[PDB]
Amino acid sequence: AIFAERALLPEGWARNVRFEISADGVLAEIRPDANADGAERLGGAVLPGMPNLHSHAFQRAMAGLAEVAGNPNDSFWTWRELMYRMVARLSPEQIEVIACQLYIEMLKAGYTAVAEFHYVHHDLDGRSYADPAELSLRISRAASAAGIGLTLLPVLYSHAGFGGQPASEGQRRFINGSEAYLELLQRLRAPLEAAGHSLGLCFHSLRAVTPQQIATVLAAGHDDLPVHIHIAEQQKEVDDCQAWSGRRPLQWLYENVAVDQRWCLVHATHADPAEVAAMARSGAVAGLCLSTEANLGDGIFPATDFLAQGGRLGIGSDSHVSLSVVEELRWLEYGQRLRDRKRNRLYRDDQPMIGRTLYDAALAGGAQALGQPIGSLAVGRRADLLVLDGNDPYLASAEGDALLNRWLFAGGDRQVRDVMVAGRWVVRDGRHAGEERSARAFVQVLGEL
């Protein structure tokens, strides 16, 4: 049992809330206006933990290292060349070390569960490992070591571009045909289940798979699983799709696939008004990765229009140049402000508070995209939560939604003090028990690279 003076519950902010948590890490009882009665008295305001709906773990290793001009027009595409050269040298052991360290940093930032969009499958020569699931299993073990919730999204990747272009050499570690991909999903069932981790279907992008492959995978019977795909991140993809099909990426997807609530459309950055409307209507989740989209010069998503139409969204750290719930949400809003040259862009008809609007939205979309029972403190949901700093003058002087505004718009990561996943404290007073060992292994890997 734990006790919070203030907690953000599904119906809104509450006081003196006593939480009972079962041995399996599930919220069993939630009583506001209660007595602490022996329960653990928490040190600040309690929020549901934030799901991270999009990650490529190995990229954290190169974070910030690609900030070197080599052309007057460096771009997403020259960055990718550099990313390819990086992933070409990574051993299974290095990948696991990077992932563990990353997930630890994620937890400290307030991310309690992650969707790993995992496309590094094979050995350095593009040959499969003795166990084809080698690298997927190492990701699961890293998540277990850090203690973070995990939806693993093994990625189908087969082509270099629309129309089934042959994969490039730089892509060799990613490549599977549909049969091998479906076998991978099969192999992953037992170990993921044992770990308490989740699974999802995943197409890298419309560039990387064919329409026929999409049909194959969706017909394979995994009808309960999330479906994730990168889409419309870069103008070049939009242009190439038009030249291939006479349609834009999102436009094509919606014409050809039965997109619904199972789906997470990552980035979706270049969505015209018709595409925005189709997304909102479908109930699919837009996977927004603000810090990476800014870092890569992707552009600004039409979040205000999307949100006005009932769109669902969540946040992902993606390339992991930033690991900050605060930064993603703050700059989601700030990007809309810079575009419109106005303030207070992302709010609901029933919720004028910006911080609360953003947090509510990202919690819900994120839980939906991961396919996990998370994103709110209700009986039957998993006990994933974070505790803010009760001694912080800004937070202590604030109440309810004002407190969210202070944190998200005037504060930072260090205001997140304690973090619980499935009823287990994994961060205490900003510290993770595995941080020392992990950093030691991590710095060695950085040196090797």
Ligand SMILES: N=CN[C@@H](CC(=O)O)C(=O)O
């Ligand atoms: N930020 C985008 N990253 C993608 C690149 C791609 O879409 O090809 C990736 O990591 O595979």
Ligand SMILES: [Zn+2]
């Ligand atoms: Zn991505």
